Amino acid sequence: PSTNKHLKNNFNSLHNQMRKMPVSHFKEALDVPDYSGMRQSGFFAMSQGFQLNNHGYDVFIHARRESPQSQGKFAGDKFHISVLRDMVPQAFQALSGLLFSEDSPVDKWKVTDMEKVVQQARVSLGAQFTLYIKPDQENSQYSASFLHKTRQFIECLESRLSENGVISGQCPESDVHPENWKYLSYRNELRSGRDGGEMQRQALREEPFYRLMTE
């Protein structure tokens, strides 16, 4: 009895429902900070419903909707966004409207503060954004409409980045992604074994959430 068990037993149903739904529209927000502003969130800041902070003891600027739209418990699903290091600020600004959108299915996310990490380290080369996904229903099961909304959202991020000519960064070796995702990648540590490497990625690819997001 769990989020994943539900996805497995309703695998085809969810996919069939999703593929029949109309394109989702996300009203992008304009009153959002630019990357420098984001880095200046300090102890506390707020932009269109999202609480922000960049504590000195961390290297990420966290964003969390005060009013969470998903009522389920986090089941490990998350996405990373990888862009060329020198383009993090450009990528942030390009995605800011969607990331702060009243329509975004993502209640919580964070972006790396490039000034706090070593240029040579992998944290600077990719996965500069992290989007946390959690089941929308109180019983912690994903609804077809939410899955569709989440996939449409992620694909919207992909198109915005490509349209802005943003160059892809280096995807983490721990994540997986299909050929058509140039910036997005998926990961779920809740079930990523202890083997890592190829074995870990193959396990992720069989995850029903990932397959519903890509097939």
Catalytic-labelled residue, pool 6, 78, 80, 148: 80
Number of H helices, E strands in the chain: 8, 7
| CATH code of the domain covering residue 205 | 3.30.2430.10
144-163 and 11-20 helices, crossing angle to 10°:
60
Note whether 102 and 49 are within 8 A (CB): yes
Q: Is residue 35 part of a domain?
A: no
Q: Is residue 129 part of a domain?
A: yes
Residue 165 tokens read as: 């000519």
Q: Is residue 200 part of a domain?
A: yes
Catalytic (active site) residue 80? yes
Note whether 126 and 67 are within 8 A (CB): no
Counting the structural domains of the chain, the total is 1
Q: Is residue 211 part of a domain?
A: yes
CA distance 14 to 71: 19
Q: Is residue 168 part of a domain?
A: yes
3-state helix/strand/coil string of 34-74: CHHHHHCCCCCEEECCEEEECCCCCCEEEEEECCCCCCCCC
DSSP label at residue 183? S
Q: Is residue 27 part of a domain?
A: no
Q: Is residue 151 part of a domain?
A: yes
**Biggest CA-to-CA distance, the chain:** 46
CA distance 89 to 168: 14
Residue 61 bridge partners (DSSP):
111
Q: Is residue 36 part of a domain?
A: no
The experimental technique used to determine this model is X-ray
Catalytic-labelled residue, pool 6, 78, 108, 110: 110
Domain of residue 141, residue span: 1-18+41-215
